[PDB]
Design a protein around this nucleic acid. Structure first.
Lengths: 129, 129, 129, 129, 129, 129
RNA sequence: UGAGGAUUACCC
RNA sequence: AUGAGGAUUACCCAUG
RNA sequence: UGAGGAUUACCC
RNA sequence: AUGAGGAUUACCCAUG
C-alpha cells in the first residue's frame, strides 16, 4: 500500500483528463499537483490531525486554475487568470468504526453526484430554490 | 429549474439508501434531513453569497450520524461522540462561466471518487502514507 | 412538497371561512395573512431555531382582529377595533423522534378540542373551576 | 358549568388514549396529569388573569414526555432530553364577547388542524420550506 | 407555495430571453441573478419593510449589464462594459386592500407599456418634448 | 412631434380606464394629472439629467390616490383618503445605443409583467416567500 | 450613496 | 435562560 | 426628504 | 473552539 498515489481529478473521458500526482509531504501536508508550471497547476492538499482528545480532523483543499498567457514587460508568461478554491474540513469522532467512516464517504459522494441539487446549483451559477 | 428537492445522500444500491428531504428554507439557507430525530439525522445545508467584489462563495455543511452501536430513537450523549461534521467552502471568481463551474464540480467528484487517495484514507481511519 | 401553503384558520363551515395565505419569509419568519388590508388582516407567523445545543424551539403567533371602520379626519378607514394575540413557544429536545413529535401535535389538538376544559373556559369568558 | 374535569389529551382512537385528570388547584392554577410518575407524566396547567386594564390573559402550559426508548417508571436523566414544553399565552381585550371568544378558539383549532402547515412541520421535525 | 422563483426579465420572443433565477434571501433582501459569469449577469433584488406606522415600503433594484470582454496583458475576462441601474421605492399605506394593490400594479404596468410617453423617451435616448 | 401627451395609466378594459393628461413642463419636470378634482387625481412626473459625465438619469414619480369624501362640520370635500407613492431612478451610461435602451425598457416591463414574482407580491400585500 | 423618512421634484 | 412579567405583539421588562 | 452622486442594499 | 467571517488560500480576522 501507500495511498499516496496519483489520481484523475477531472475526468474528461480519457481526453484532457486532469490527473494529479504526489508532489510533497513536507510538514505532514500531503500535496498533489498537475503537470504544469507551478503557476498554472491544479493543487490538492490533505492533512489529518487529532484536533481534540476525541476527534480527528481532515483538512482538504483543491485549487482549480483558469489558465492564461500574460504579457508582462513585453514578455509572455504562463499564468492563471484566476483560481477557484475548495476548502473542506471533516471532523470525525474517535469512536467511529471503519464502516462508520465509509458512510461519511458515501454521503460525500452522493452529495456531489450529478443531477443532485448542489452540483446542479453550482454548475448553473445559481442557488437552491 | 427548481433544485430544492429530495435526493439520495447514501446510495446502498436501492435497499437501505438514505434519502434526505427539504426541511427548512429560513434565510435562503436550504436544509435537507433524513427521517430521524434531529440527534440521529443526516443533515445537509447550502447557501451562496457574494463573499467579496471578485468572488461568490458556497457554504455546504453535512452532519453524519455514528451508526455502529446506535440505538434508534435513543438519547445518545455526548453529542460529539456520535456525529461527524463536514464543512465545505467553495470560492468561485465572478468570471467563472457555467462551463468553468461544471469543471469545478468534476474536480470535486474526482477528488471523492472511490479508490482515490482521499476517500480511501477517510474510509480506513487513516492519513496519507 | 413545501409546507408553506395556505390553510383555513377559521373554519366557519364553507361560508365566511377565514383562510390565510403565505405572504413573507423574510428573516426566516414565515408569515401568512388573510386577504384584507394589512390593517384588518389576520396574521400567523412561525419560526424555528436551535435554541440550545440540545433543543429546538418553535415560536408561533396568531393575531385575530376585530374589524371596524373608523372616521379619522372626516374620512373613513378600514381598521381593527382591537386584536387578540396568541403567542406560543414549543421547546423540543433534539432526541425526539418523528413519532415523538406526532405525540406533541396530538396533545395540542386534544387540548383545544371542543368540549374539553380549556376551549370551554375561553369561549365562555371564565376560568377553570 | 364546572369545567375542571378529566379529558383525553392524546386521542389514539379509544385504544391507548392518554387521559389527563385534575391534580392540583393551588392558587387558582388548574393542573391535570396523566397516571405516571411526574418525570414521565403528560402535564397541563391553566390560569386566567387580567394582565392590564384592557386585557385578560390565559397562561396554558403543557409538558409532553419523549416516549421512544422510554423505560416506564425509570430514572431518565437529563430531564431536558426527555421532555417537550409548550407555553401558550392568549391575550384577549376586555371587549371580546363570548362570540368573539368562540372565534379565537376556532382560530386556534384551525392552526393546529391536521394537514395544516404548522402541525406538519412539527410532526416531521421540520421548519417551513 | 413560493414566489421566490425563476422568471423571465427580458422577453425576447422565446429565444434570447433573459431569465433570472433565485440566488440569495439574506436579511430580507431577495436576490435573483441570471446565469453564466456573475460579472455579466442581470441582477434583481427586492425587499419590504414597515417604513412607518402606516406604511409598508418596497425597494426593487434591477441591473442591466452591457456584456463585453476585457483584455489586459493578453488575459481576457468576461465583464460588463458598464451597467444601467434601476431603483424603485413603492410606499403603500396599511389601509390598502388587495384591490387597491392590484390597481397600483396596473398603474405601474401602464406607465411602462409600449407606446406610452415614458418607455418611449427611454428606448430612444430621449426626454419629454 | 411630441411625447408629452395624454396616456392611459390604468387600463381597466375600456371603461374605468384612468387617463392622465399633460399639465405642466416647468424646469424640465414634465407633469401629467388625471381629470376632475386635483385632490383626487393621479399624478405622474418625469425628468432627465446628465447625473455625471457618463450618466444620464431619469426620475419618474407616480401617485395613486384612494378616492374618498371628507366630511367636516357638514361641509364635505372630495379628497384622497391616502396616496401610494412610486419613485424610480434609472441611470443610463452615455454609451448606450438605442438598442441598449430598448432592452432596458424590456427588462422593466418584464419585471412588472403579470405573474412574475414582484407584481404578484405587491398586488397581494406580500413580500417574497 | 443609504432595503434612510415623507404631507412626495420635500426633508435626513 | 427563566417569569400564571407587560405590549401598542418577531417588541419591551426583570432576574440569572 | 432631496428631478442629490454612485464602482449600486454604498455614500451625501 | 466557534463564524452562510475574508483571502492574494496550509494565510488573516473576530469572538470565546
Amino acid at each position: 500500500a501507500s495511498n499516496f498515489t496519483q489520481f484523475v481529478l477531472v475526468d474528461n473521458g480519457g481526453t484532457g483528463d486532469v490527473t494529479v500526482a504526489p508532489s510533497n509531504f513536507a510538514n505532514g501536508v500531503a500535496e498533489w499537483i498537475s503537470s504544469n508550471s507551478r503557476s498554472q497547476a491544479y493543487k490538492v492538499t490533505c492533512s489529518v490531525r487529532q484536533s481534540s482528545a476525541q476527534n480527528r480532523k481532515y483538512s482538504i483543499k483543491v485549487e482549480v486554475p483558469k489558465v492564461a498567457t500574460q504579457t508582462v514587460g513585453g514578455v509572455e508568461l504562463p499564468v492563471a487568470a484566476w483560481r477557484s478554491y475548495l476548502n473542506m474540513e471533516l471532523t470525525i469522532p474517535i469512536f467511529a468504526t471503519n464502516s462508520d467512516c465509509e458512510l461519511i464517504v458515501k454521503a460525500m459522494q452522493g452529495l456531489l453526484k450529478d443531477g443532485n441539487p448542489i452540483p446542479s446549483a453550482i454548475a448553473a451559477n445559481s442557488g437552491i430554490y
